[model samples]
Target: KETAAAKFERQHMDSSTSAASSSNYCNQMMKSRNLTKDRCKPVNTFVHESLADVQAVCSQKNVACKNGQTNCYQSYSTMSITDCRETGSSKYPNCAYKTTQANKHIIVACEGNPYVPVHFDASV
Candidate 1:
């Protein structure tokens, strides 16, 4: 099974794309990155930073998860990221998403013995 850190890297980390200017970026990326599988992920974020930098966010400050868990943390600095949200009219096999890029601090949930991010909480 893939570790949480590994999954986070594959699903969220994309250092190459600092800007998602292309309108179809989400449509292409959501499908290409395997996020449009059984169903479209309602919302997701892709960080435009190196893996090392994103992993280090755990050493920063702590925050409350939506479910009130203490495993969440905030990035020390704002980062370049693309937020993908499933469109209302999107259907399976043709999952669509609205892509928006911004520089903002992210909230993520961490766990396990090694203590790496496991879930994307929110962007603030």
Candidate 2:
């Protein structure tokens, strides 16, 4: 069974690929990761760094999450990331995305005894 932290990694981590290889990167990834099985995930971001580095953010002080939770922390170091945003013309099953690559500090929500990132909140 997949834990929230594990699910977060599956949905948002892509250390193997430093940046978008092409415009179809998100389209391919979102489907390959099973995020487009039922419906399109409106937006998502993949971090281009090691899992260990992302987990370390849990050690930082908590900040308010996008939904107003307080268990979120912003990575101290800016990281390479690719944002996948669904296009307005996209539909279910045939999901489409626009890939926007950038370096930014990611904000994530952490939980569990191991205290790892379980939810991606935002980037700044």
Candidate 3:
């Protein structure tokens, strides 16, 4: 069984490389991460930072999630990231995305006893 924390890592963390300027970065990532199987994921972001750095976000200031929950925390430092946004013409089984690279603060929702990030809430 996969834990929420592991799922978050699979979906959001990418410390190996910051990703090339390749336009297909999202297309490859979204598929490889299993996020475009059943349906096209509208949007997702990948952080090009160390797991330790990302996990430390849990200790930062708690904030409201997009759904208005209070379990989310924002990273104190801006990190390198890539936003994968579904194209208007994208469809399931052949999902497409527009990749945008940037440096921004990340927000994630934490859970459980150890208080690790379980959901990628947003990026600012």
Best by TM-score: 2
lDDT of each: 0.85, 0.91, 0.89
Model 3: per-residue lDDT, tens digit, 46-101? 98999999999999988999999999999998999999999987767889999989
Q: Write the per-residue lDDT of candidate 2 for residues 1-124, one digit (tens) a residue.
A: 9989889999999999888899899989999977888899889999999999999999975789989889999888799999999998787778989999999999999999998999999989
> lDDT at 23 for candidate 1?
77
Please list the residue runs of candidate 2 whose C-alpha ends up more than 4 Å from where it truly belongs after superposition: none
Better of 1 and 3 by lDDT: 3
Kindly list the per-residue Cα lDDT of model 1 for residues 1-124, writing each as its tens digit: 9887788887888888778859778888888767677888888788888878877888898999989999899999898899998888887999889989999998989888777888888889
Residue-pair clashes per candidate: 0, 0, 0
Question: How many clashing pairs does model 1 include?
Answer: 0
TM-score result, candidate 3: 0.93
Question: What CA RMSD would you report for each candidate?
Answer: 1.2, 1.0, 1.3
Clashes by residue pair, model 1 = none
Worst 10 residues of 2 by lDDT: 87-96
